[PDB]
């Protein structure tokens, strides 16, 4: 009955409690993550999630990505007949998460705790409750992403200073939480345009150059190929969190006669063409520290949010910034906020 929702810029996820235990529900496509993308076919059927993402490029004008960046605004999109305010759009992702979590439980849902980033304001938090209501959902309370995370690791002792390093698909947030058994967010920072999607982007570029170098063909102007490259670029990034190397092989990607794309990306190479993206993490981390006036040695815990924290380079970097402190592990780092959420929704229900 108690449910929590991570309404992310690029991906959303929904968790429900069973016993005093959080479970991360799988969407109707079999994934525990649902892209935060809403789209309107040239007919009037609404596609939400992966089916929206798949067609984003061939239907650009009717596809809305990162609607979360618009929430506390008067932003709107005109689809033939009507305007949809940001809350109306978010709602659609909530409706899909709703139909999907019902399926898994067999029963029905009407109430949830929803997370929000800590820097949100009242207009924004509110826009979030609205979308909640628009989706036949009664938003119980509403907590912020860092707090949610800490809750997933149940960090309610006595006192403590917690560092939350959150690297999502499209944003990077770093917060310093302080625990008395209450949780106040003391300092914040980030880079609103720093996400894992950028790491994947560099690999797509690398692939485009290497190929051009071989065939003299520019792929950017080919949608099918490009899509194929995004997929491949992503899996490559993934194999790199484990291997020191990965092969991209894309049979008959174009012609002139078909051409095969076959290339090997070394983790080292990967790290090299992504070094600026990673470094972009120092200053904000450092800021949060200075605001608080703390030596790194006084961080009691660090919890990593974001599937792209899985990357060795980030881990290594976090280690050095934190003075060698090991981050907590246990919860999928990109299920961590939704999990904290179902937990708070539990304290209530």
Catalytic residue among 68, 96, 98, 129, which?
Answer: 68
| 158-194+281-331 and 1-157+332-349 share a CATH fold | yes
Catalytic residue among 6, 88, 130, 200, which?
Answer: 6
The residue extents of the domains of the chain are 1-157+332-349, 158-194+281-331, 195-280
Domain 158-194+281-331 matching CATH 3.30.420.40: the answer reads yes
Torsion angles phi and psi, residue 136, rounded to 5: 65, 25
How far is the C-alpha of 58 from the C-alpha of 222, rounded, in Å? 11
Catalytic residue among 130, 166, 334, 335, which?
Answer: 166
Domain 195-280 matching CATH 3.90.640.10: the answer reads yes
Could you confirm whether 68 is annotated as catalytic?
A: yes
Could you confirm whether 96 is annotated as catalytic?
A: no
Resolution (A): 2.8
Query: In the CATH hierarchy, which fold is given to the domain comprising 1-157+332-349?
Result: Nucleotidyltransferase; domain 5 (3.30.420)
Could you confirm whether 145 is annotated as catalytic?
A: yes
Cross-strand pairs, 302 = 163
Catalytic residue among 100, 145, 200, 335, which?
Answer: 145
Residues 6+ apart with CB under 8 A from 180: 158, 159
């Amino acid at each position: 009955r108690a449910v929590g929702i991570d309404l992310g810029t690029t991906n959303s996820v929904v968790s429900v409690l069973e016993g005093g235990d959080p479970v991360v529900v799988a969407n109707s496509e079999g994934s525990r993550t649902t892209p935060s993308i809403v789209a309107f076919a040239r007919n009037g059927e609404v596609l939400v999630g992966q089916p929206a993402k798949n067609q984003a490029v061939t239907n650009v004008d009717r596809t809305v990505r990162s609607v979360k960046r618009h929430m506390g605004s008067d932003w709107s999109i005109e689809i033939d007949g009507k305007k949809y305010t940001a809350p109306e759009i978010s709602a659609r992702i909530l409706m899909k998460l709703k139909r999907d979590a019902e399926a898994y439980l067999g029963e029905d849902i009407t109430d949830a705790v929803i997370t929000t980033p800590a820097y949100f304001n009242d207009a924004q938090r509110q826009a979030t409750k609205d979308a909640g209501q628009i989706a036949g959902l009664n938003v119980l309370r509403i907590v912020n992403e860092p707090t949610a995370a800490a809750l997933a690791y149940g960090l309610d002792k006595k006192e403590q200073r917690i560092l939350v390093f959150d690297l999502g698909g499209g944003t990077f947030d770093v917060s310093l939480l302080e625990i008395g058994g209450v949780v106040e967010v003391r300092a914040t920072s980030g880079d609103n345009h720093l996400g894992g999607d950028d790491w994947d982007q560099r690999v797509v570029d690398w692939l485009v150059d290497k190929f051009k170098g071989t065939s003299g063909i520019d792929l950017t102007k080919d949608k099918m190929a490009m899509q194929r490259l995004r997929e491949a670029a992503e899996k490559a990034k993934i194999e790199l969190s484990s291997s020191q190397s990965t092969s991209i092989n894309l049979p008959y990607i174009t012609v002139d006669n078909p051409l095969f794309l076959d290339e090997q990306l070394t983790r080292a190479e990967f790290q090299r063409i992504t070094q600026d993206l990673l470094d972009r993490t120092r200053k904000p981390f450092q800021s949060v520290i200075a605001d608080t006036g703390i030596s790194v040695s006084e961080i009691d815990h660090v919890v990593l949010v974001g599937g792209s924290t899985r990357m060795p380079a980030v881990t290594d970097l976090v280690k050095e910034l934190t003075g060698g402190k090991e981050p907590n592990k246990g919860v999928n780092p990109d299920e961590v906020v939704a999990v904290g959420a179902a937990l708070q929704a539990g304290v209530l229900k």
